[PDB]
A paper describes a structure:
Gh-ChrR belongs to the superfamily of NAD(P)H-dependent FMN reductases that catalyze the metabolic detoxification of quinones and their derivatives to hydroquinones, using NAD(P)H as the electron donor. This family of enzymes protects cells against quinone-induced oxidative stress, cytotoxicity, and mutagenicity in both prokaryotic and eukaryotic organisms.
The crystallographic asymmetric unit contains four monomers, each with a single bound FMN. The β-strands are organized into one parallel β-sheet, β2:β1:β3:β4:β5, flanked by helices α1 and α5 on one face and the remaining helices on the opposite face. FMN binds in a pocket on the surface of Gh-ChrR near the dimer interface. As a consequence, the active site of Gh-ChrR is open and solvent accessible, a feature observed at the active site of oxidoreductases that facilitates promiscuous exchange of substrates. While bound FMN is observed in the crystal structure of Gh-ChrR, NADH, an essential electron transfer component of the reductive reactions catalyzed by NAD(P)H-dependent FMN reductases, is absent. Regardless of the forces holding a negatively charged Cl− ion in place in Gh-ChrR, the side chain of R101 is a good candidate to assist the binding of an anion. Negatively charged species analogous to Cl−, including chromate, ferricyanide and uranyl ions, may be recruited to the catalytic center about R101 at a favorable distance (∼3.5 Å) for hydride transfer from FMNH2 to the metal.
Author numbering:
A (entry chain A), B (entry chain A): 5 to 188
C (entry chain D), D (entry chain D): 6 to 187
Write the structure that this text describes.
Amino acid sequence: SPLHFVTLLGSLRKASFNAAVARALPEIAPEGIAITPLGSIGTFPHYSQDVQEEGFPAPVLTMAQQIATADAVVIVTPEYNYSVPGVLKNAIDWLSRVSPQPLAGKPVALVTASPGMIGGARAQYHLRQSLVFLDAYVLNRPEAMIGQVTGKVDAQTLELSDVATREFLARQLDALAALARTLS
Amino acid sequence: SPLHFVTLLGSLRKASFNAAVARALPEIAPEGIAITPLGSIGTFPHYSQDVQEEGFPAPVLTMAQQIATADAVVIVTPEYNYSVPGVLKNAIDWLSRVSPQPLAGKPVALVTASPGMIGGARAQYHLRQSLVFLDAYVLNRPEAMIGQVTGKVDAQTLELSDVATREFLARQLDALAALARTLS
Amino acid sequence: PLHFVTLLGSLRKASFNAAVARALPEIAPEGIAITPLGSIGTFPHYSQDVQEEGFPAPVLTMAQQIATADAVVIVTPEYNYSVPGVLKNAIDWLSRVSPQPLAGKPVALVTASPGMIGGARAQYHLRQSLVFLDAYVLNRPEAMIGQVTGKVDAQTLELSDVATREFLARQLDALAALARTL
Amino acid sequence: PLHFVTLLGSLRKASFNAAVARALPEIAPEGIAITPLGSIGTFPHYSQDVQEEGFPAPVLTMAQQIATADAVVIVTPEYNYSVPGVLKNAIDWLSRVSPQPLAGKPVALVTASPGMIGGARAQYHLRQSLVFLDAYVLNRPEAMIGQVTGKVDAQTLELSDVATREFLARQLDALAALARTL
Ligand SMILES: Cc1cc2nc3c(=O)[nH]c(=O)nc-3n(C[C@H](O)[C@H](O)[C@H](O)COP(=O)(O)O)c2cc1C
Ligand SMILES: Cc1cc2nc3c(=O)[nH]c(=O)nc-3n(C[C@H](O)[C@H](O)[C@H](O)COP(=O)(O)O)c2cc1C
Ligand SMILES: Cc1cc2nc3c(=O)[nH]c(=O)nc-3n(C[C@H](O)[C@H](O)[C@H](O)COP(=O)(O)O)c2cc1C
Ligand SMILES: Cc1cc2nc3c(=O)[nH]c(=O)nc-3n(C[C@H](O)[C@H](O)[C@H](O)COP(=O)(O)O)c2cc1C
Ligand SMILES: [Cl-]
Ligand SMILES: [Cl-]
């Protein structure tokens, strides 16, 4: 049983640490699980009910269908102002108005990375609150808060090289895989 | 002592109930307090550190200076997916990177309106969490959650006419005024 | 073939949440037996010192009834925009138990309140603790019983409101489907 | 000319948060007297039934020491991603007091933990209750003492760490400025 996971990325900057983390998920995945990245949340317009009425942005239905046809989603994001980046919450707001709504019943795992010690934990719980409304099924264990990320991805090379973080994340994908196969 | 309050609006749609609420604040204000609306959060680009480096969007510094020169801010917003609209969190993310940062030390009052019973309370507390980081001074009492807003603003005329809601909000501005004069 | 237990967050005899909790066995969908756990009020305040002189008997007892239950329904009021301390104290004791009763446990929440918001805030704080305990907490439908005052007979102390009974039976239906699935 | 009281969220003799709480009077900026409130452990579990037979004596006592204090420093661990039930129980009792001691009260929070996060999650849940109580809770600087194990002498039970003592003295400075301002 080959699973397909897609990753949703909360940062827009080229040198993003969270992006480096996301890029590593596919090389980290345990055999039997392919992982690809979704489109950029940066292509979405700001959510407006007027825009919705005129019609859903193509990039939003694209992301909706890729999530819906995926076996699980891994959300990978920094924490902004003790919460979720507004850009990322904005992508969530759009996906939440689609019918059928793509996150409903969808296995979901969260990963946050910060240069600081909290490792973006404040973000994960606000994001959970929204996901309750969307009826996603978010993995409780293990939680992935990557503090001091600056020390875990080597500079100029962009890559996540920290061995223990790769182990941790690889095991989180396994649990996500097990969660998905159990709601199947 | 004449105070000046500005209002930050969380919805983009023309027929927004929260917009109707905001529009009423100035006619509601107690003598000695002028209230004007800020620019639209819809003119901001998605927050990106790359964009920041190239330079702050003009609409962001505009809003920063209007807030900083204001005696207090009233934030008026719907709740999206049990949290703050991503568009509004995105405007918050931008303002948070300005120097000096405009919300630091700023008296702030929150107002949320929902057609439902919760009246957007889930949003107010997530928004508070962010505002702690920004060092804003957000009014505890009275809290303004306007549930069943559909019944409180008359249709086709756009206006907030519910007498008790106007009283409640007018008294919340007074408390905001008292909070501001006390940090002065 | 399905057994649910109820954990109650108010101690006062005339508690609105207690009324709600008593109706659950009555309105439950057939094939579902729902029984009440013991009172959270018999726990001492958590303390690691006390724990190291062995677990309070009722703590092991409740741990036992939860662990071998198919699901837990937590029915509680909201105190100060959050979970009642006494309820949270129960949850704290249970979280230290030998193997921890709530790991993997299907859970539904029900809050009741005289006010507008119906204990909504309490639920989300509770969800955050349940994450750490690896409980599987039902998303839909959420049960917030605001304006409880008019839905419970002031004498008799039974939730009269028919619509509310029907709603809770549906939440039970959903909680069952969550349990069988997991 | 400034008086702060401390409210402690752990009951265990060898509590890391207790160590932190004892250092506060020592490192306090001159002109600031800091004394400990009574133990939250002497409260019974909240109940409206108990309340209607009059408030537990220690509840009125603590209400009294808080109300006439210039500020409160709440020092507590994090239990299950939230506030310890026993601490929350104290807060629950205080919230019902005659006039409520925390309305308008300047407050700083300090959490300590062996782990990375240092009780961060606890603080934000607590802030949500304090909103309803109209406490004025200091934003900057926030004091999360992660990895507390290495900052407190295992024998002696005093927070040895110099940097941490210096940080807390600054938070006290800030809490004072908040108090004089309000
Ligand atoms: C607007 C803004 C808000 C931020 N808020 C937080 C925060 O609340 N907590 C935190 O640890 N870091 C915060 N940061 C710092 C980010 O954690 C850090 O910039 C991180 O590397 C961004 O992730 P990225 O590298 O994937 O872009 C914030 C940064 C910005 C620009
Ligand atoms: C994407 C989206 C998410 C929403 N989330 C919530 C919610 O969590 N709680 C709620 O009560 N209403 C929610 N609503 C409904 C809004 O409360 C309602 O549409 C409101 O009138 C919008 O405010 P406005 O009239 O100022 O635009 C949501 C609406 C949208 C479009
Ligand atoms: C200490 C305390 C705190 C309370 N906090 C809230 C609150 O934050 N929101 C609310 O709607 N009701 C609050 N209430 C009121 C309860 O919702 C109400 O008393 C309810 O009936 C208690 O549940 P019960 O009837 O099952 O005992 C509080 C009550 C007490 C005693
Ligand atoms: C019931 C319980 C729940 C706990 N939950 C957490 C938690 O969520 N996060 C954390 O970092 N530590 C948690 N801890 C560990 C405490 O942070 C640690 O025991 C700390 O030393 C307690 O504070 P104290 O030393 O002052 O008693 C928990 C401990 C207990 C007993
Ligand atoms: Cl930062
Ligand atoms: Cl809706």
